């Protein structure tokens, strides 16, 4: 709680940064600088998309999750260090997908989670992002191709940035991109409007 | 009219219900060197009585004779546990910041310093 006399002799301002998924990925990539190989950069890319997805799903208090959590840059930093350590000593390129999946789900991005179904849906998101097949459909629209053996950091960075720049953020991204049914967000905004209308009815009685 | 009621009280003591601490500042500005503040203390009140200095006390029971003008003329004031000589120019003020015993309330000249919906209506009409 802020002290009483400071908040009165001041101009109180409240902000809301844009919750779009695309701007989070672009901000993460601009904050990023890559420096070790190409597979580490590709895994950092996948991890940044995963962090963007979980940050988008955080705001859905009663349907996307069960309690408003607070992720930040430090959790993504630790996950990035874990990814670069895993793909810095396991140079056989036989990717230990189970190791990174379990360590991200149950330790890095499950450290602050107490409920069980929240961890189950985090594990589902990990399985979706880190399926480790020959193709990846991170959303039903765009694909992130796997790198090849004949690239350095600069060309892979350029190629993945081009994959960012082609697709525009869709209007209904809050259900298709997060893999959530439309009726769920419909009920969420229904409860939002119910709270707003009930509050206005209570204020209208005076 | 608050300050008019304050200055037109030569018999009953006035009350300063001023959590904003503006009344004490304007009173001290008007008075100057004759202002002493309290919150030992009996001794300094007796010294102020003997010297003839106006006293203001914050956070408003042994000042019964002074608040009731129960003076002995031979003019001495029996305050606390010893008689104190009266200079004749002694004045007392009571200040508080909490918006109170019944005996004090029915004796002190109570005034209110509170802004409310009536106050904002008067303010918008005045502007």
């Amino acid at each position: 709680k802020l002290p009483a006399p400071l908040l009165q002799r001041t101009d109180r301002v409240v902000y809301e940064d844009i919750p779009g998924i695309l701007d989070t990925v672009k901000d993460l990539w601009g904050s990023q600088f890559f420096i070790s190989g190409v597979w580490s950069v590709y895994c950092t890319f996948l991890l940044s998309w995963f962090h963007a997805l979980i940050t988008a799903r955080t705001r859905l208090v009663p349907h996307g999750f069960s309690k408003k959590y607070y992720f930040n840059d430090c959790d993504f930093q630790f996950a990035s260090v874990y990814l670069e350590n895993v793909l810095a000593t396991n140079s056989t390129n036989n990717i230990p997908w189970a190791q990174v999946r379990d360590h991200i789900a149950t330790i890095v991005y499950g450290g602050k989670i107490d409920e069980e179904k929240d961890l189950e849906v985090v594990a589902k998101l990990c399985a979706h992002v880190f399926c480790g097949s020959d193709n990846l459909q991170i959303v039903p629209g765009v694909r992130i191709p796997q790198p090849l053996l004949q690239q350095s950091e600069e060309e892979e960075r350029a190629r993945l940035t081009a994959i960012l720049s082609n697709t525009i953020e869709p209007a209904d991204s809050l259900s298709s991109w997060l893999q959530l049914p439309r009726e769920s967000i419909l009920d969420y905004e229904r409860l939002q409007a119910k709270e707003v209308a009930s509050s206005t009815e209570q204020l209208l009685q005076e | 009219e608050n300050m008019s009621i304050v200055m037109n009280s030569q018999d009953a003591v006035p009350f300063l219900l001023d959590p904003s601490s503006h009344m004490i500042t304007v009173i001290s500005n008007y008075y100057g060197n004759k202002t002493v503040l309290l919150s030992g203390f009996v001794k300094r009140l007796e010294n102020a009585v003997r010297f003839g200095s106006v006293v203001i006390i914050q956070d408003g029971p042994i000042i019964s004779r002074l608040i009731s003008r129960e003076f002995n003329h031979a003019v001495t004031v029996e305050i606390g546990d010893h008689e104190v000589d009266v200079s004749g120019d002694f004045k007392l003020f009571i200040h508080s910041c909490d918006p109170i015993p019944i005996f004090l309330r029915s004796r002190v000249r109570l005034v209110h310093f509170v802004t409310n919906k009536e106050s904002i209506e008067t303010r918008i009409f005045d502007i």
């Binding site: 230990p96 330790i107 | 009953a12 019964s64 004796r107």
Partner: protein, 1585 residues
């Protein structure tokens, strides 16, 4: 001021109270501080500042001289440790001696002394800091421990007992021929170094202890290397178990397991290594079967490790693919060892999830290894992840889910000793900051158990410190600047935090830590592995059944506060299994019997049945001790019961193992009995002698329990607990080496007391004391808590203690009757037949119906049937003993009739003294119906006299006593009910039973008590009136004035023939403490039950032999009364002193009216009608008025006593009266005593017309209304109706005399204030007269009181506790030496403490106060009264003169003293005057006779303006509690003053205008202006009014 200050400064000296010579000490600091704190003024100020400087020097020099004596007087090695340091403290000793000399025989010199003191303090602080720079593990301890360690250098000891502290997990050191060869762990494991530590005389503690820990690191490394080599040589682990210490075998075995598992993981091979692990496990179990204790603990720890290895390999062989194989292997802890690293202690690193950390090679002892569950591995993984990037782990979850011991297990598995700060409010900033700095210096990782419990400022400070440490950790800075020091920082250190939300981590710590959840500890695998390591052949099924049983117990039964069915209870059951394993073997029987021995004592009744049914559902299924218990019970008379036998066997089997046992049950259920008989049987069986101790908790304080530093002398004091602990721990007499000791707290559990008892309770068997006294707890020191409820039992104690629950009473009615009869027989050719007759008297077929038809009635101070039969049988036995003299010479029918009558009366007075009289009658016919009509039937007035039937009406004395005795309140009138009460009270007092008197106020409980005991020559009474705040020194001071000690060990009455009885009043009045308990009542229970107590400054058992306890109290239903717990009331009986019937009132007051007609016997034939009139009016007032209408509507015979007292004093102070005049005077007194607190004048006139009807019914007469009555003695020599005109003339003459003499206050005169001053004069002229003043502010009540005080010639005074008592003493001294009739006034603003109200209550319940007149005061009072003229006669004269020479009148505004008004003793004498608000007539007349001072009529109009003022006043108060008239009065005063000033100003202005017009008489304009002014002047004047 100046003279007193100079005199006390020149009188300053010192007290010779110190030990040996030392420094001459001084006490009473605070009085000196309160006393001490132009040229002459500045000189005095400078002297005061110098004196304050010397005062600060004094307190600092003694506060430091205590430690100076501690470290220099008793030992010189501390001051001789180092050369320059030795010179510095030799100079210190020289300075100390010379300042002692100059203190014996200046101020600036002593300021130079404090300068020297501060620089030597800085020198020693820097010396300690440099010693800790040499060895930062010394910086763990406080300064005193450092001084002890450096003093015992050549002594070479006392570091072996701090050996627990500075290295964590080591108990003691061992050393041969002045050379250390190893250390002994906390478990007790011997260690051997690489080489012995050769020692010299010139040794410092720091250097050889650095050698000690460096070489213990090297030695554990050496044994690990040798064990690794020997295991690489193919040696089986079973042989080499006993060779190497636990750390070595753990590290070597885990490294070998890592190497073998990665070798077999490089291929798809798991069978051979799993078979090898299984063979190792089986061989280790076989060796565990035949091991010694050290071998057993090493083997169980290695079995924990190898069960983990078995689980890991079994998990890995389920890995069908290689990727999940690396998944599973990379997550568990991997133990690698370097090969080419030349550094010995950095050759091993631990790999966990791709990271690595450095082992530090410190000994860990052999603690209970945390069994390896997957969640433990996940916690290790996330802690490794946090630590890898220079961060700190944060843990959060539910309470007791495995956080802090998980961090300690991390420290164990990484080989580090972790310091745990057990968070509590007693922690402060400096010691926690010091331990944090030590953790930074030495690099030892540190956990924080339950971090959220700190206070706000301390949590913020430690958060800042931890943030600085972390910030230094990430940036790699080796010098963090905190605590004003640039302390070194090893990169291997860490900081750990654990907490429980439901708060979370603070944001400053949250930005640099990482969270984790561990909500559900996997109990199934823990139980499975514990059952496997215990040796049971069936681990999985038994563990699953135990988990199912625990969850079903936690779900099905009612969730009691003390219940727990989680993990710690499961581990306690598994630990308790092993002694049952040794007898019953391994199987289901052992665990089911352990469950029957552990969880069964904590269960209830329905929970017990649920547990039994679930035990039958899940699970399928020694008499020498039973015989011993039966023999003990049969010897002591406790006839056993099946429930009682089950409970006693349960308690014995529970105390077989667990040290700390708590007994819980409703009061009076046999807890004391069951542990007494169990421990007697235990002493018979095992042969050890028993010693028991009983201590009451709340009556003693913590200072009297343990002790503290003294406020001035700083001297340690030994409390009771410290005394008994020192006695049982010294064992100088040799008793406590084979004698069993039982410290039992016969009191309810207190949270702030169990907070101190946790230091007793903890596992290390050490206690925390302010003076630094460490005391061990031997195995015979068993602690027992017997309580009555668990309302305040902390859940931290419901599991960590041992709990026994007594849901149902373990005794039957028949067995209790038999035991009580046998005890009464043993309490004493004829005794045998008498015992047989009493045994056959209790025909239980009718007694059962008696109990069933007696428990239904309303029991005031309700007690069950289980605690009144004690009183019943004891009264029956005592009456039989009294009548035993004439029972051998009489026929059997008379004997059976007499014993039947006696038991009938005993049951009637033990089962109906808690209900009304008609309930007693109905009980007596119920008894006569149950026992049949064959025997003698007890009647309401039945009595047996010398030997046949009689009645109470035979012995009643119809005494025609004198007239003046009604002024004396101690005189008693006799009646049948009074004699019955006295007889039963006398029997109860003689029967050695407790007495409690209850009933509505006004029945005369104290009055009948003083009747029964003043006439009693066999006893004495000391009476104490209780207060809201009551202390144990009240009762001690009360008894010391009439009792004496003797050996002390025994407290006896001062007389040798009179059994002294302590009386107390208003037991319900004292308030509860902060935890719902009261100390005085438990003290009384301790006196009345165990006949002994403990002295608070001496801790001695003061046995009581000839003192009984009686008590009179108001019922708890009334306001200001709090109920007592049944524990106190179970020892006593209840006598409902109800309201006597109106016929008894008529008889009592017709003797009173004969006595009052003695003075004027011309109307001696009218005693009865006035008694009937008083009875009728009081009965109608009771049936009409009720306390719902107003708080002070309480009616009693106190009104009638005051009525007859007023009539008597009127007749004494009055002339000859006719019949009509006497009727009128009696009506005047009745209206005064009754119609002064009623609702309104309508109630007064209703009382008047009822009085009319009753008088004309009894005495066959005009208007006798309120205002028509005016009785005074101002205008007549004696009380008679005087004329109002001459009365107001006389009081007007006195008013003008007073205004010309002393004070000319602005007062008025009207008939209302005439009535007020007449009433207050009537009260002041009466002996012991007081009033309340229910009036608003500025109503002139105090002014009228002062007026009447001057009229009566009363001396005038203007009123902390000590000053109040000194003023009282001066006033009573002036009263005794000068007959000073001084009036005293108290307002509500005059009273701020309830002690003044309490002493008013005491002195007005009595006529004086006993405990304020004792010692020197009593001796001087007796001497002075002998100067004015036996102690009793002089004190009676003192009581009479203070009754006739004291008058206090109280002023109240709100009708916090409501309970004081409702207090019967306060209400007894003072007449409550409802001044109220002024009425319309009163305000109109006061306005109309103030307006006449100032002429205003120039335009009637006075009535108009007064009507407007009063109507606006009423409208303001009705559109805006008595209505305050202050607004009206100061409004009219200000109006009068403004009118006077404005009239004078207008007269001057009109005179000036007339002068100007006359001077003026161009002129046309001036004439027009003057004419316009003269024309508008009248309109402006009306507008001006």
């Amino acid at each position: 001021s100046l003279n007193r200050i100079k005199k006390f400064w020149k009188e300053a000296q010192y007290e010779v109270i110190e030990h040996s010579s030392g420094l001459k000490l001084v006490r009473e600091w605070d009085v000196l501080e309160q006393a001490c704190k132009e040229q002459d003024c500045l000189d005095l100020e400078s002297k005061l500042t110098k004196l304050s400087e010397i005062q600060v020097n004094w307190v600092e020099v003694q506060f430091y001289w205590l430690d100076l004596y501690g470290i220099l007087g008793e030992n010189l090695d501390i001051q001789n440790f180092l050369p320059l340091e030795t010179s510095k403290f030799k100079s210190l000793t020289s300075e100390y001696k010379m300042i002692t000399t100059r203190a014996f025989q200046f101020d600036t010199t002593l300021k130079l002394t404090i300068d020297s003191l501060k620089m030597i303090k800085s020198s020693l602080s820097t010396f300690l800091e440099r010693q800790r720079r040499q060895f930062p593990r010394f910086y763990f301890l406080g300064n005193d421990d450092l001084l002890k360690i450096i003093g015992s250098g050549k002594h070479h000891d006392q570091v072996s007992k701090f050996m627990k502290k500075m290295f964590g997990s080591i108990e003691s050191i061992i050393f041969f021929e002045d050379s250390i060869t190893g250390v002994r762990s906390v478990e007790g494991e011997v260690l051997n170094l690489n080489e012995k530590i050769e020692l010299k005389d010139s040794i410092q503690a720091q250097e050889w202890l650095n050698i000690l820990d460096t070489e213990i690191k090297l030695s554990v490394f050496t044994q690990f290397r040798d064990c690794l080599g020997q295991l690489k040589d193919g040696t089986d682990i079973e042989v080499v178990v006993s060779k190497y210490i636990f750390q070595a075998i753990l590290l070597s075995a885990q490294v070998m397991w890592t190497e073998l598992v990665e070798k077999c993981l490089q291929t798809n091979e798991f069978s051979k290594y799993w078979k090898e692990v299984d063979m190792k496990i089986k061989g280790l179990l076989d060796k565990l079967n035949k091991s010694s204790d050290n071998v057993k603990k090493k083997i169980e720890a290695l079995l924990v490790e190898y069960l983990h290895f078995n689980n890991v390999i079994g998990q890995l062989k389920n890995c069908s693919t290689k990727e999940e194989a690396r998944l599973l292997w990379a997550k568990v802890q991997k133990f690698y060892q370097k090969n080419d690293t030349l550094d010995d202690l950095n050759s091993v690193f631990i790999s966990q999830s791709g990271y690595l950390l450095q082992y530090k090679f410190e000994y860990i002892g052999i603690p209970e290894r945390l069994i390896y569950t997957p969640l433990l591995l996940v916690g290790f993984a996330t802690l490794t992840d946090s630590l890898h990037q220079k961060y700190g782990g944060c843990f959060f979850g539910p309470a007791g889910t495995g956080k802090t011991e998980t961090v300690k297990a991390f420290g164990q598995n990484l080989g580090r000793v972790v310091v745990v700060f057990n968070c509590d409010d007693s922690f402060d900033y400096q010691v926690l900051s010091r331990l944090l700095v030590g953790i930074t210096q030495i690099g030892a990782w540190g956990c924080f158990d339950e971090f959220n419990r700190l206070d706000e400022k301390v949590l913020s400070a430690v958060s800042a410190n931890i943030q600085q440490i972390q910030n230094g950790l990430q940036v790699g800075k080796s010098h963090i600047t905190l605590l004003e020091e640039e302390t070194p920082l090893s990169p291997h250190t860490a900081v750990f935090i654990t907490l429980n939300p439901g708060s979370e981590l603070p944001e400053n710590l949250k930005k640099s830590f990482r969270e984790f959840s561990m909500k559900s500890p996997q109990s199934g695998t823990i139980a499975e592995m514990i059952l496997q390591i215990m040796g049971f052949e069936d681990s999985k099924s038994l563990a699953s059944k135990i988990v199912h049983f625990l969850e079903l117990l936690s779900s099905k039964c009612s969730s009691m506060n003390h219940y727990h069915f989680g993990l710690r209870t499961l581990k306690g059951v598994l630990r308790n299994c092993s002694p049952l394993v040794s007898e019953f073997g391994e199987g289901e029987k052992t665990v089911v019997e352990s469950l029957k021995r552990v969880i069964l004592p904590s269960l209830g009744d329905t929970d017990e049945l649920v547990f039994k049914d679930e035990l039958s559902k899940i699970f399928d299924s020694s008499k020498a001790i039973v015989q011993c218990l039966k023999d003990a019970g049969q010897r002591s008379g406790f006839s056993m019961s099946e429930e009682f036998l089950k409970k006693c066997m349960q308690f014995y089997y529970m105390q077989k193992t667990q040290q700390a046992l708590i007994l819980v049950g409703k009061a009076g259920c046999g807890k004391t009995a069951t542990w007494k008989t169990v421990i007697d049987a235990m002493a018979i069986f095992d042969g050890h002698a028993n010693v028991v101790y009983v201590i009451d908790t709340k009556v003693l304080t913590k200072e009297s329990l343990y002790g503290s530093m003294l406020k001035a002398t700083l001297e340690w004091r030994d409390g009771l607990f410290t005394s008994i602990l020192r006695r049982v721990n010294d064992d100088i007499t040799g008793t406590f080496k084979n004698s069993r000791i039982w410290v039992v707290f016969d009191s309810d559990l207190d949270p702030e007391y169990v907070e101190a008892m946790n230091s007793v309770l903890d596992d290390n068997k050490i206690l925390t004391l302010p003076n630094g006294e460490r005391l061990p707890i031997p195995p015979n020191f068993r602690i027992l808590f017997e309580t009555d409820n668990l309302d305040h039992t902390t859940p931290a104690t419901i599991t960590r203690c041992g709990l026994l629950w007594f849901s149902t009473d373990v005794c039957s009615i028949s067995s209790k009757i038999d035991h009580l009869l046998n005890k009464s027989y043993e309490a004493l050719f004829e005794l045998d037949k008498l015992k047989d007759l009493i045994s056959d008297s209790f025909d239980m077929a009718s007694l059962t119906n008696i109990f069933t038809c007696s428990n239904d009635l309303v029991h005031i101070l309700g007690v069950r049937t289980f605690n009144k039969l004690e009183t019943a049988v004891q009264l029956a036995v005592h009456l039989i003993s009294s009548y035993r003299q004439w029972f051998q010479n009489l026929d059997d029918k008379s004997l059976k009739d007499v014993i039947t009558l006696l038991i009938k009366r005993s049951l009637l007075y033990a089962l109906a003294g808690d209900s009304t009289g008609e309930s007693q009658r109905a009980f007596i016919q119920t008894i006569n119906t149950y026992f049949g009509h064959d025997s003698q039937e007890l009647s309401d007035y039945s009595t047996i006299v010398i030997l046949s039937f009689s009645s109470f009406c035979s012995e009643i004395p119809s005494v025609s006593l004198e007239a003046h005795e009604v002024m004396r309140p101690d005189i008693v009138i006799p009646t049948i009910d009074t004699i019955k009460h006295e007889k039963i009270f006398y029997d109860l007092l003689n029967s050695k039973r407790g007495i409690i008197l209850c009933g509505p106020p006004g029945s005369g409980k104290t009055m009948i008590m003083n009747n029964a005991l003043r006439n009693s020559s066999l006893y004495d009474v000391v009476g104490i009136n209780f207060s809201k705040d009551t202390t144990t020194e009240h009762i001690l001071s009360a008894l010391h004035r009439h009792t004496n000690y003797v050996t002390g060990l025994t407290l006896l009455p001062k007389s040798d023939i009179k059994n002294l009885v302590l009386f107390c009043d208003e037991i319900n009045l004292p308030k509860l403490d902060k935890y719902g308990s009261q100390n005085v009542v438990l003290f009384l229970r301790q006196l009345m039950e165990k006949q002994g107590f403990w002295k608070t400054p001496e801790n001695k058992w003061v046995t009581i032999e000839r003192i009984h306890i009686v008590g009179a109290c108001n019922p708890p239903t009334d306001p200001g009364r709090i109920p007592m717990s049944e524990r106190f009331t179970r020892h006593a009986a209840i006598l409902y002193l109800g309201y006597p019937s109106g016929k008894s009132l008529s008889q009592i007051y017709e003797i009173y009216y004969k006595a009052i007609f003695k003075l004027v016997p011309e109307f001696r034939s009218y005693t009865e009608p006035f008694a009937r009139a008083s009875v009728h009016l009081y009965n109608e007032c009771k049936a009409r008025y009720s306390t719902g209408l107003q708080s002070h509507y309480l009616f009693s015979p106190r009104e009638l006593t005051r009525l007859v007292r007023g009539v008597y004093t009127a007749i004494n102070t009055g002339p000859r009266q006719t019949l009509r005049s006497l009727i009128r005077l009696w009506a005047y007194e009745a209206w005064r005593i009754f119609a002064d607190r009623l609702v309104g004048v309508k109630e007064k006139n209703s009382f008047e017309q009822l009085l009319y009807e009753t008088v004309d019914k009894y005495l066959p007469l005009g208007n006798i209304s309120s205002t028509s009555l005016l009785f005074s003695g101002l205008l007549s020599l004696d009380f008679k109706e005087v004329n109002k005109t001459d009365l107001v003339n006389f009081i007007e003459e006195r008013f003008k005399t007073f205004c010309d003499e002393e004070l000319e206050v602005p007062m008025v005169i009207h008939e209302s204030m005439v009535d007020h001053i007449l009433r207050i004069d009537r009260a002041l002229k009466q002996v012991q007269g007081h009033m309340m003043l229910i009036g608003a502010s500025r109503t002139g009540k105090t002014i009228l009181t002062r007026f009447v005080a001057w009229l009566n010639g009363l001396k005038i005074v203007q009123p902390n506790l000590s000053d109040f008592d000194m003023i009282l003493k001066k006033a009573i001294s002036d009263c005794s030496l000068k007959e000073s009739r001084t009036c005293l006034i108290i307002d509500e603003s005059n009273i701020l403490e309830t002690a003044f109200l309490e002493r008013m209550n005491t002195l007005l319940a009595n006529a004086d106060i006993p405990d304020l007149f004792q010692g020197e005061e009593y001796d001087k009072l007796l001497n002075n009264l002998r100067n004015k003229t036996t102690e009793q006669e002089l004190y009676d004269w003192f009581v009479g003169e203070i009754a006739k020479n004291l008058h206090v009148v109280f002023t109240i505004c709100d009708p916090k003293s409501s309970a004081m008004i409702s207090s019967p003793a306060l209400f007894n004498r003072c007449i409550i005057n409802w001044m109220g608000d002024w009425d319309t007539k009163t305000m109109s007349q006061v306005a109309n006779n103030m307006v006449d001072v100032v002429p205003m009529e120039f335009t009637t109009i006075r009535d108009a303006v007064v009507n407007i003022l009063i109507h606006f006043d009423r409208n303001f108060y009705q559109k805006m509690n008595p209505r305050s008239p202050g607004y009206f009065i100061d409004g009219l005063r200000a109006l009068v003053k403004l009118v006077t000033a404005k009239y004078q100003d207008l007269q001057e202005n009109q005179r000036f205008v007339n002068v100007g017009l006359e001077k003026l008489n161009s002129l046309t304009f001036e004439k027009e202006r003057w004419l316009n002014t003269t024309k508008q002047f009248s309109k402006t004047s009306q507008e001006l009014i």
